[PDB]
Every structure is written in C-alpha cells, then in structure tokens.
Design a binder for these strands. Structure first.
Lengths: 98, 217, 54, 54, 259, 333
RNA sequence: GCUUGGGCAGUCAAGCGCGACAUUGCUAUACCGAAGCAGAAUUCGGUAAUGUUACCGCAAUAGUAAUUGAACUUAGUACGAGAGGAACAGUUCAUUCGGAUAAUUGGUUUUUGCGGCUGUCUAUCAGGCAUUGCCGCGAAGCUACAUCCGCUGGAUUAUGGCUGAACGCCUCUAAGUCAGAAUCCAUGCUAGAACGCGGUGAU
RNA sequence: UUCAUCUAGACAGCCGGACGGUGGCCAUGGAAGUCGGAAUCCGCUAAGGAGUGUGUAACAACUCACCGGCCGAAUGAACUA
C-alpha cells in the first residue's frame, strides 16, 4: 500500500481493515524496520453503519509509533471517516476525509 | 480565567471543542466532565451545543468560526447544518463551504476581528465579518490559535512571522507548547476573551504563558 | 431480620440474640475490602459493644 | 514509600477494631483445622510427615 | 526462603527443575541492583546502610549455586534407570539447601530497598523534622552516623538551646553551605520559611436548540415528502416560483407536442 | 455446531408449538400473551439512535428488518388445565356455537369429498337454554387453576391459497381464573386486534421452522429479544405515513413481495430476521418475562423505510416515479 | 491391585549389636486465604396396529452455550515524597463461536436474458451452425466481503461469620444457622416414548 | 498399663500479690527482663525466670510460672488394645 503521509516513503508493507493498527515495514535505512501502521484507505466498500458505501482510489495508510505519533507533519490524500474519528492524531494531520 | 479540564481522559480539548465569545460547540456525548469544563467558570452564561460534523467527534477540527458566525465543510450533512442553525441565534451566521475539502479547523484560524487561511475569501469575510489575509506550516489551523486579546502559535513559529501577525492583528503574539510539550497548540486548548480551557497535561509554565498572552490579569 | 437505634455508632437491640447477632455479622461482612491491604485500610463497620438492653 | 509508612499509620490511627478478637478466634480455630487436615487431604502424606517432624 | 523455594519448585514434578531454578536465581540476581555499580552517591549510601561484603558474598554464593545446579543437570532394569532420577533430584535439593544464609540476608534488604526515599542525583537539595514537614518529599519549584556524615558528598542552627544540645557542640559540628538559624553568642560567628529556599534557588539553578420563535417547537419536519428531501428546498414563501412552475402544466401542456 | 440444537432431525409438525408461556400475574387484568402470523418479505430500516453515550447517539443508524403478516385472530374456545403430579392435564374444553369455514376445513383432509359434517350436534347442543354449557363453565371455574384460550388465524385474508386456518392456544396471565373464564365466555366467535397484545418497541420472540435446504434445515428454532419496529393495522391510514414521514404510502415493496402477495391487513415489523422463509406460520411471544435493558426500553424513530421494488433489482418508490425518472413514455402519451 | 519427589563416611536413639525428625565434609478465566499488600503490579496456597378418524395439548426421557477484549464513569479520585495509580456499580463498543436471513452490497451463472457484432447465408427485414458463438450489461440458485439475536432463581466446594458442648476457658461444629465458585439443580431452548398420557368435532 | 496431684482442698474459671541491690556486667545516639553477648546471687515471702510472651527508638501498660482468696472430687502427663 502507498504511504498516507508526507514522509516520502515509497510504499508500506506488513485480516486488518480500515482503522486497525498492525506492525508494518517501509519496504522502499528504513529497510526491515518494523513500526505500527494505521490503514486510512483500502479501495473497497463495506457495509457501513451509516448505510453509505464508501470508496477510495487506492490502498493507503500511515506509519507511526505505538501511541500513533504521525511520522510526517501532514497526510496526503483523503482519510477514511471512521479512521479519522477513531484516532485524534490522524485527524489533526488529516487534510481531507473521503 | 484559564481552566484545566479533560475529555474522555483525553487532553486534546481543541479536537472536540470550539469556543466563542457568544457560544460554544462541543462533541456529542454523556461525559459530564466535558460539559463541566465550560460550565464551571461561567455556569450557563453562554449556550453549549452538543453536535457533530459528518457524524464525527472531530467537529472541533472540522469547524472554524467566530462569535459572529460559523463555517462547516462540504461533508457536513443537511441535518447537522439544520441542528447547528437551530442551536444558534440568527445573529451567528452559518454557511457551508462547497469547495473540495473537509478540514476547516486545520486550515483556517480566525478571531472576531481577523482571520488567517492557507473566491472563498469573500465568503469567509462576510460570514465572520473579519479581514482575511503561517511560518510555512502545512496545516496552520492544527498548529495555531487566536483570540481578540491575543493568540498562540506553535513553538517552531518564526519570530518574524509572529511579529508581522501581531502588528497586523494589533495584539501581541506568543509561541509555546501545550499538553506538556505537545506542538499541536490548536488541538490541546480552546480560549475566548475571558475563558481558556487546557488539558490536564498542560504544565504550569504553559498555563502561565497562556494567561499572560491574553492578559487576563 | 431486632431494632435499629442511636457519635458515629449504630445500636441494635432485639429479644432474640441470634437475630441481632446475625444482623451485626452481616453488616460487618458486607464491607469487604477486596484486593486491598488489610492493615492499611480500616474503613468499614465492625462490632464494638455487647450487652443487655436494661 | 518512606522508611516506615504502614507502621506510622498504625501508630497514628491504630489496628482494626476487631483485629485482636479475630486473631484470637483464628488461633483457636487452628486447633480444629489441624485435626481436620490430619483427617483429610500426596498432600495428606506431606502433612503427616510435617506433623511428625514438628 | 530456601526450604519454601525447593518445595515450590519440586511440587511441579528433569531439566525443567534446573530451568526453573536458573530462572529464579536470574530473577533474584537481575531484580536486585548491583550495590557496587548503581551510582557513586547511591553506591556509597547503600554501603553505609547494608553490609556490602555480605551482599557480594550472597550474590557470589547464588551465582555459584546456579552454576553447580546447571553443571549437575548437564552431567545427568527399571530400578537401575530410576535411581538416577532420585540421585539427581537429591543432589539438586542438597545444593539448593545451602542458600539459607544468603537468602536470609537478602530477605531483609529485598523489602527495605523497595520503599527507600531514593531520588535522582540531578534533583536539587535540633528537631529538623518539623521544618522538613513544614516545607513539604518533593517540592518541585518553577551505620546511622556514617549515613548522616555522607551528606558532605545545608545546616540548621538554633538560637536557643532547645533539645538539651549545647551550642558549642552545634558550632563544632559545622566543621557552598547555607546556615539557617532559628562569649556564648560570639562563638556563633566562627561558622563564617520559604525565604531560605528562595535564596538557595540561586545556587540550585546554578548547580438547547432554538428557533425563530418557540410557538411551534413541537414540529418534527419529516424532511421527506413522497420520497424527495424537500427540506433542502424548504424556502419561505416562494411566491414567484409558486406561479412560474405551477402554471406551466396548463399553459404548455395544452400544446403537448411531445409525441 | 451447537449440541443444544441436536439431533438434527426433520420437524414432525410444520407449525411450531410453543413450549412455555409467560408467568401468570395474579394482579394484572386478563390479557393475551401470544399472537400468530405469517412471515412475508424483508426490507431495510433506518433510524436515529437515542441510546445514551453511544457511537451513533442522536445520529442515524441502518439495519435490516422483516415483515410478518398478522391478520386479526378470532377465538374459538377456552381450554382449562389442572395441576397434577404427572404434569398439566386438560380436564374439559368448551367450543363456540359457530365456527369459521377455515376452522371446519382444518379438521378435514378430503374436505371436497367429505360430507362437511363439522360441529353439528355440539352446535345443535347450544340450542339448549345454556345449563349444559354453563355446567361445564362452572366446572372449569372451580378447577383449572391455570387457563388457556384456543384461537385461530384468518387464512382467507392473507394472500395465500392455503385457505386452511391454523389452530393454536393462547395463555392468559390475568388472575382469578374465574374472571378469566368469564371474560372468555364473552368473547367467543370474536376477533381481537393485534394491538391488544403487542405494541411499538415491545420485545418478543418468534418461533418457526427454518428453510429446507433439500439433512439440513426444516427444524423448529426460537429467536428471543426481537424488537417490534412497527405494529401495522389495516384499519388505520397507510402504514408508510410514519410520524417522521407523514406521507400516505403502502409499506409493501412496489410490484409486490418476492413470491408473496401484497400486505394491507394488520402486520408487524420485527427487528432482525425471523427463522424460516416467507409463507411460514410464526408464533409471537412476549419473551416469557420482563427483560430490563436499554435495548428493550429504547424506542424506534423510523425516518425512512425502504419500500422500492425488489424483484431482482429496483430503484423507484411508487409507480408514478418510473416514468418521471425515464421521462414521458409512449404508454403515457 | 501396577504406581508418583542422592551416594559415601560420623553424632544421634521411641524401641528392637540394628533402629525415627534433624545434622556434619564433596558433587488459561473466575472466586477465596497470606506476604512491608501505601496504589498499581507481583508472589505463595485452595476450588475448579393402540376402537377408526382429525385437531388441540401435557411431558417420562435424551442434549444444551455462549464467549474474549476495549472506551466514558467511578479518576487522574482513595492511595503516595513524587513517579504512578484502584475496585464495585451505571453506561457504550468491538473480536471468537452458535441459531437463523438475504433487505443493501458482493464471488456467483442454463434469466443459456438484453443492444451490437465475428466466419457466413437462405441482405437490413429473420440468426441458421460455431460439442456451450463473441463483446458490454445481467436474472434465478450456491453463498459470504452482507444482517438480527445469543436467559435468570435456588442448592453448593474452598472461604468469612452467629449461637454454642466436648474440656465450668474457648471454638464457624459436635446439634442448628447466614453469605458464597467459570460446580449442581432449576427457567428457557431442541427432539418427543413405532409399545407414556388428557380434551374435543364425526358416525 | 505406668506415674503425678488429691478433703494438708483434685482440673478448670475469675480477683489479688507478682518485690528489693537493679536500670546486674559488657554493649549505648536510646535499649531499664523481653533489638544483642556471657553467669545466672543474695534478703525475703504463701509467691518474683537479673524474666515465657504482647508492645514503645527507652521507660509506660498487661501477662505465665509461682503462690494466696472466691471455688468443690476426682483430675492431670506419658504409654497399650
């Protein structure tokens, strides 16, 4: 999946869904470095409790420490509504939602 | 005066709050502590509105307005806009931004007289009745705060930018941290001309700086 | 089950010894300081005095 | 966590109201509990060996 | 103690016993802080209190016992193969039983070290307990003889002679340091409540919804009429539209040239 | 799976039989306890959750519901039960003088070829002054410390070709069983509305045989804590004109239900999916007790109801919108 | 009537020169009791055909279930020099498993459906043949990346107590007695004895 | 079964006495019988271990073993079946 921050990471590498935090690595000094990541987009629509079938363009996520401290100072691209509300830190750096 | 409060054991008051001289916006929830945060100093002096933007608790991050008006992003639903209109008097102007964007509180920081943003400028000026003009910050709103008495910015703000804004704002500006060194000044506290709310992590030096900049004493 | 009357002290009187004694025991045994240090914590209600009504 | 805090608190306030009576009752009941363990309870053999050693 | 630990370990059952003993010994050793390597100030302070020689002897004895148990475990009809297990278990028990003295010594210090008034070295500094209680202990702003003597690594004086202590003794005991005062009065010159702390701070640093009217507050505004969200188009008294978009069905439908 | 639902053998009776009834109340007045209906269709429901401190507090929430056809139930008799060491026993039963055609048919397997010799002598026995029937009523009054009422549903009203009514027993939680039998005596051959038993937001349990999968399925199952979203009534205005919509329209999906007829008579909307497919016979019971929880106490705020066509696919709500979406049509002009 | 956890050398000595307890040199969840348990955390111990016919009914008996974690609130309060930080109860969510359903979505496949079309023909009018025509779209069925729900009363192990002899003290125990376990029985749920039963319509 | 007490008062339950050199010597930041080391005396009185325990940094206070008073017959310790 692509990285959802301005850190410049080419891609992210490790079921986990949007808003779930799992260990992740920056596939492409950061090689083979494990750090928790939060998924902000998955490019798939699920049965939302609000009844609206959300959609995204591509899978994306953010890499942060266990407490969720965003590595970058901003988030590139839209962020899932559930993920943004779940994590206040993500919302602070989030620019657009969906 | 400045007050130390919390929300769901979280010190990010600004994320779930937006204070104004005539009203206050807070996220929906049964946590009496959050309501007490604003009710302790002034009781029921000004109304407190429990609502949300796009059905989220980040209303504080998604809302950017002053005592004279309020603004909400496109993601805001019609029902939420109607609830906000019913919860505020006709004096406060409420309008929806139709531009492609969602984070208004993280991009726009303004007070009752001046507004700073990253056409929509005319709409912002009309709704808030303020002049529309920070140190290269990607998200000025998330790392800035303002009030008629004064304003607070992130510690990394350049001295030149602070001086220019203070000269334009006609009031002094001070850069400091919140919530025990946290650099998100706009997410850890919300202040008005006579009441400042800060999280528990806010240390004594930060509280003193907040009190001094707004010159309550 | 016995009467209640009154310092910060309760007074229980009843014709039947068993009834009043069991009531006092139940009152003392409901204030269980679970998962706490017995010596450090003294809060509760305990039997103090016994005697005849007369 | 000072040099002596539980002892200081006990001296300032004292032990529990029924600490003495409860301890005496436990000591008295230990006599019957020893017999019950001897007539009850590998564990029984170990208890018997410990009693014989005592 | 040694007896209780042996029973606890042996009640769960051959290498498992040795592994458990090694784990317990490692936890005891690692959990306890090395007296000679904590910190110079704290090292000396612990030296004045506990028997450092006995502490080191106990640590060495525990390490040697663990090594011996590991060595024994590594070295180690039905009766012929059965007696070996009993012999190994007895060997381990006998080796463990020799720890009563070091374990007894460590029992006293294990509890004591858990509630010491230890503070970080970077922390800024006649009945002095009364003043200590009054001042605050943490006051963040902005063997006994040797332990007391180690304060060299502030002093208090009394103008009167309270507690029965001679003024001459107080003057002699004195021999930067700040002196606090609550032929006899002249000898006091030989030395040469928050105010004292304020003065010392120098060196310390240098160290609800409404409407237009409440007449119709009970209205619900269904927000849907025949499947269209008319609320978005609920403009007040649209008189021009009410005619413009309603007269068409008669003015233009008369022609009706859709076919 | 679940050992409690074994052995997995085919159900002997198509109609599920209630195993237990709510505990009787000696102080409350005589009232019904269970109702009969037929499952019919499924649709989506949206509302706003007033549950305090919830993730969707004072905000919209969506889920799925099911509709059960519940035509008015008409009583046919009263059954008394006595307490015996071997279990509850029925000592005497009294039937009404007149019975519906469906009730008579239910007692037949060759109704067309049979002589239709239904209650004739018992019906003729009612021509007496009343001593014989009153004697049995007095006997039931003396004995039968617990009483039940036998009723049946109006199959003819439902859009089905079965034309055969289903007979079932209804328990009464009233008190003074003498008062119970007196009340029953005054309601023979009388129809009782659905609202008399259940109401909106009430919690009930539905029992029915699950779908047969060609051994898989065809077993009686029970689902408890089934909130009644709505209690439809054919006598009232269009059931689609909710308080939050107040617009006249039928709840039935446009074009009719899938493999089922239109619903216009009294019906009930049940949260979740009741076991079994459409055209079943489902017995409604009031949970056998009082469930204390926010789930039972919370009310329903139906802002919108999905009533569009569902035969494969559908987008319009009423037939008038089909041409409006596609514009004027040739068949229109 | 299998079975389950130190040798050598010396002092022992209830008893019968042998012989008892010590002793000297090597080689998961949950609930209770104790700890210097200040809070949290932690450690040690314990529990685990039958009269035919049709309907409405009872239940002898067999099986049984829910489950794991998270958030507000109690709270940044009792506690504590600060670091750190409770629990009960009132609320809100999610994960595993289970009884079911297809309302939206979606893998789906004889709509072997719809507009056009390929090699080609009596050429658009009509698709014949292409073991199953193709393109794009798409029914019914399998069926989940889809959805609803998943119960309350006693008796009890350990445990803490009341009254009170043995033993004129005493004792939770010997006669009695209260609270109490993921334990037992009950409520509920599934089946209903081809050979358990009751009432009713019909000759 | 073997011993001890026993109408010169059996076991048990309460009340009283339970001292003087003395706070023995050493150990002392203060430890006086009871945080420790080594002997254990005289005067006595029906009865005091330079002390069997609880407890205080030390005294303080209670105490069992030792006797007396109120009490009234068998009781206690160890062994065998």
């Amino acid at each position: 999946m692509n990285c959802a921050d301005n850190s410049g990471a080419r891609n992210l590498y490790i079921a986990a869904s949007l808003g779930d935090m799992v260990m992740a690595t920056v596939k492409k000094e950061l090689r083979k470095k494990v750090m928790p990541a939060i998924v902000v987009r998955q490019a798939k629509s699920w049965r939302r409790r609000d009844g609206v079938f959300l959609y995204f363009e591509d899978n994306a996520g953010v890499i942060a420490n266990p407490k969720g401290e965003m590595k970058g100072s901003a988030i590139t691209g839209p962020v899932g509504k559930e993920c943004a509300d779940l994590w206040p830190r993500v919302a602070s750096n989030s620019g657009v939602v969906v | 005066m400045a007050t130390r409060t919390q929300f769901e054991n979280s010190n990010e008051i600004g994320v779930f709050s937006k204070l104004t001289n005539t009203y206050c916006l807070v996220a929906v929830g049964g946590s009496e502590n959050f309501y007490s945060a604003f009710e302790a100093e002034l009781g029921d002096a000004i109304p407190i509105v429990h609502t949300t933007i796009a059905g989220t608790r980040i209303i504080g991050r998604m809302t950017a307005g002053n005592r004279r008006g309020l603004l909400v992003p496109t993601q805001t639903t019609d029902q939420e806009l109607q609830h906000l209109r019913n919860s505020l008097p006709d004096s406060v102007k409420i309008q929806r931004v139709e531009e492609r964007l969602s984070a208004l509180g993280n991009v726009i920081c303004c007070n009752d007289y001046v507004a700073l943003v990253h056409e929509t400028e005319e709409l912002i000026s009309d709704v808030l009745g303020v002049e529309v003009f920070i140190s290269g910050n990607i998200l000025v709103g998330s790392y800035c705060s303002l009030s008629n008495q004064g304003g607070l910015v992130h510690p990394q703000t350049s001295v030149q930018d602070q001086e220019e804004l203070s000269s334009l704002l006609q009031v002094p500006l001070v850069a400091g941290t919140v919530n025990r060194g946290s650099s998100v000044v706009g997410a850890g506290m919300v202040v008005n001309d006579y009441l400042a709310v800060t999280g528990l992590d806010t240390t004594a030096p930060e509280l003193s700086v907040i009190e001094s900049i707004f010159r309550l004493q | 089950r016995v009467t209640i009357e009154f310092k910060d002290e309760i007074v229980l009187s009843g014709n039947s010894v068993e009834d009043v004694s069991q009531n006092a025991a139940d009152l003392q045994q409901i204030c269980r300081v679970r998962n706490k240090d017995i010596r450090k914590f003294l809060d509760g209600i305990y039997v103090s005095h016994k005697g005849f009504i007369t | 966590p000072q040099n002596d805090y539980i002892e200081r608190h006990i001296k300032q306030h004292g032990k529990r109201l029924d600490h003495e009576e409860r301890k005496r009752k436990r000591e008295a009941r230990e006599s019957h509990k020893i017999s019950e363990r001897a007539q009850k309870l590998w564990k029984g053999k170990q208890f018997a060996k410990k009693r014989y050693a005592e | 103690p040694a007896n209780d630990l042996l029973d606890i370990v042996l009640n769960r059952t051959v290498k498992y016993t040795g592994e458990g003993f090694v784990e317990k010994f490692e936890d005891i050793l690692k959990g306890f802080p090395n007296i000679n390597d904590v910190h110079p100030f704290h090292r000396d302070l612990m030296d004045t209190l506990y028997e450092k020689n006995h502490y080191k002897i106990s640590l060495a004895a525990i390490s040697r016992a663990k090594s011996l148990v590991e060595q024994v475990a590594r070295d180690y009809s039905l009766f012929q193969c059965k007696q070996l297990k009993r012999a190994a278990l007895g060997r381990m028990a006998t080796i463990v039983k020799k720890l009563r003295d070091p374990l007894a010594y460590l029992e006293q210090v294990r509890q004591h070290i858990g509630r010491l008034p230890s503070i970080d070295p970077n922390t800024r500094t006649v009945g002095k307990s009364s003043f200590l209680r009054c001042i605050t202990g943490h006051f963040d702003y902005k063997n006994i003889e040797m332990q007391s003597i180690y304060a060299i690594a502030l002093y208090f004086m009394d103008l009167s002679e309270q507690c029965g202590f001679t003024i001459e003794a107080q003057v002699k005991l004195f021999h930067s340091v700040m002196v606090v005062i609550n032929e006899r009065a002249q000898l006091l010159e030989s030395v040469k409540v928050m105010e004292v702390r304020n003065k010392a701070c120098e060196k310390l640093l240098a160290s609800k919804y409404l409407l237009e009217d409440d007449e119709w507050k009970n209205d619900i505004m269904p927000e849907i009429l025949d499947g269209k969200n008319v609320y978005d188009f609920l403009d007040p008294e649209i008189a021009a539209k009410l005619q413009a978009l309603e007269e068409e069905e008669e003015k233009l439908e008369n022609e009706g040239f859709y076919n | 799976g679940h050992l409690g639902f074994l052995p997995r053998k085919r159900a002997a009776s198509i109609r599920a039989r209630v195993k237990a009834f709510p505990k009787d109340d000696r102080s409350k007045p005589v009232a019904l306890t269970s109702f009969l209906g037929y499952k019919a269709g499924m649709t989506t429901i949206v509302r706003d959750l007033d549950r305090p401190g919830s993730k969707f507090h004072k905000r919209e929430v969506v889920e799925a519901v099911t509709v059960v056809d519940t035509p008015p139930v008409v009583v046919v008799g009263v059954v008394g039960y006595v307490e015996t060491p071997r279990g509850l026993r029925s000592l005497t039963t009294v039937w009404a003088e007149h019975l519906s055609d469906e009730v008579k048919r239910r007692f037949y397997k060759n109704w067309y070829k049979s002589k239709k010799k239904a209650f004739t002598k018992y019906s003729a026995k009612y021509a007496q002054d009343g001593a014989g029937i009153e004697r049995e009523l007095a006997r039931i009054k003396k004995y039968a410390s617990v009483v039940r009422v036998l009723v049946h549903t109006q199959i003819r009203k439902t859009p089905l070709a079965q034309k055969k009514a289903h007979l079932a027993e209804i328990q009464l939680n009233g008190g003074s069983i003498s008062e119970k039998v007196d009340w029953a005596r005054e309601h023979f051959e009388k129809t009782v509305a659905v609202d008399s038993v259940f109401e909106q937001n009430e919690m009930i349990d539905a029992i029915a045989v699950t779908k047969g999968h060609g051994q898989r399925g065809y077993h009686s199952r029970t689902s408890i804590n089934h909130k009644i979203y709505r209690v439809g009534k054919g006598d009232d205005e269009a059931n689609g004109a909710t308080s939050f919509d107040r617009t006249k329209k039928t709840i039935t999906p446009m074009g009719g239900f899938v493999h089922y007829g239109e619903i216009k008579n009294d019906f009930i909307m049940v949260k979740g999916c009741i076991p079994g497919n459409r055209k079943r016979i489902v017995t409604l019971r009031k949970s056998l007790y009082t469930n204390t929880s926010r789930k039972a106490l919370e009310e329903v705020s139906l802002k919108w109801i999905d009533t569009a066509s569902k035969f494969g696919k559908g987008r319009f709500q009423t037939p008038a919108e089909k041409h409006a979406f596609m514009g004027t049509l040739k068949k229109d002009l």
